[PDB]
């Protein structure tokens, strides 16, 4: 009696173990093909502006014409650069003309230590501002090349949002390629439903066996009726195994369809991959142009402050220069006259 | 690149 119920639990455990084997095999095959093919419909996302880029566009509009004012400010900085260079050139011309006249004067006859020493300080101070100016020349030049490099995107990011979205590349798929996408998406849907019903059918079979072990064991008790009762339960198990076997057999036709669709998808796959590469490429130049905009605001301010301080010094040195050179010439006028 | 552009000190 106790051995008949034990022989039936072994028969139930065996058929359940054969079931779990056929499922693991079919899943192993199925998983290898999915992993090997690597396979979606988020094509509308290309038509959207990423939220992080919209926050940057809105930042260029909280202050009206910030890109225009940055461009103008760069032109002002470029203006005071050439002004400094020209005043430094004026001081040079005065020192060169004075040194020429002094050589001619010392030849025509056989001076003043005070003006000579002031003229030497002007020369020293001039070369100081020449070294600082030429040092900041490469910096000023690179600042303007960077401005020119990014101003077109900064104008784009400042304009209306629809032109920003128009700068991004969109998919241009023919009706044939959409069909290849739809067919591929339809088969993948069938694969997932096959996976779901497989998990479901196995659970039902496991629960049918579990409920039979709660019933004809944990509460009730039989006698010689174990022969017919085991046939009743076994009929229920076999009907579910029929559905499960249909599910397993169906996998072979589905894999053939999926691998065939994957061959048609190969041209579309590369087109869409190049579109994603291009989309993130243009997006990153817009991000980089916004990053350069912050750095340009900072360095444009540093440059205008530097060259304003430097223009003031060079303008003041030009005053000392023309005063010293004029006085030194008046001295040569007086001396060479009384000769 | 342009972040490391420094103007001289006076």
Author numbering:
A (entry chain A): 5 to 43, 48 to 118, 123 to 351
B (entry chain B): 262 to 271
Quote the original article:
HD-PTP (His domain protein tyrosine phosphatase; PTPN23) is a non-receptor tumor suppressor phosphatase (Kok et al., 1997, Toyooka et al., 2000) that regulates several ubiquitin-dependent endosomal trafficking processes such as downregulation of EGFR and PDGFRβ signaling (Doyotte et al., 2008, Ma et al., 2015), recycling of Src (Chen et al., 2012, Lin et al., 2011), and degradation of α5β1 integrin (Kharitidi et al., 2015). HD-PTP has a multidomain organization that allows coordinated binding to several ESCRTs. The CC domain of HD-PTP is solely responsible for the interaction with UBAP1, and residue F678 in this domain is essential for binding (Stefani et al., 2011).
In order to define the molecular interactions, we determined the crystal structure of HD-PTPCC in complex with UBAP1C at 2.5 Å resolution. UBAP1C adopts a rather extended conformation and binds to the shaft, near the core of the three-strand coiled coil, between H4 and H7. Only residues 262–271 from UBAP1C were clearly identified in the electron density maps and the side chains of I263, L266, F268, P269, and L271 are in direct contact with HD-PTPCC. Pocket C accommodates L271 and includes V504 (H4) and L682 (H7). In our HD-PTPCC-UBAP1C structure, the FY pair (F678, Y679) in HD-PTP forms stacking interactions with F268 in the FPXL motif of UBAP1C. Upon UBAP1C binding, E514, D667, and K671 side chains are displaced breaking the K671-D667 salt bridge and opening the A pocket. K671-Nζ then forms hydrogen bonds with the C=O groups of I263, K264, and L266 in UBAP1C.
